[PDB]
Structure 1
């Protein structure tokens, strides 16, 4: 969670299911905004902001 410091890789597709979530496709390179929760990380996906499951992304 240093905001904007790090990139993460989408390891799976994920379709947003609630309003604070965001959609990503496997292979997308996301900006990490907030990693303080163990289960949901806040990311930027082409500049949309939202939460995706932490288990579906990794650092490069």
Structure 2
């Protein structure tokens, strides 16, 4: 259910969450799933993807 921040994190974009070590966080269930850093073998581009959009 609930996690705790091991480290400070400063947001790098408009969608990530800043937090300081020790905060208590709850994971939100979204349709998109976990996000992974991926490389497209098709296009050569790279960045984060919604795991629920892909399959092995």
TM-score by length of 2: 0.50
Q: Which is greater in Rg?
A: 2
> Which stretches of structure 1, 4 residues or more, deviate above 3 A after TM superposition?
none
Point out the structure with the larger strand share: 1
In the TM superposition, what is the alpha-carbon distance from 1:38 to its structure 2 partner?
6.0
- Unaligned runs of at least 5 residues, structure 2: 37-56
Unmatched runs of 5 consecutive residues or more in structure 1: 1-5, 40-60
Normalising by structure 1, report the TM-score: 0.47
Aligned residues: 34
| RMSD over aligned Cα atoms | 1.9
**Structure with larger RCO (C-alpha < 8 A, sep 6+):** 1
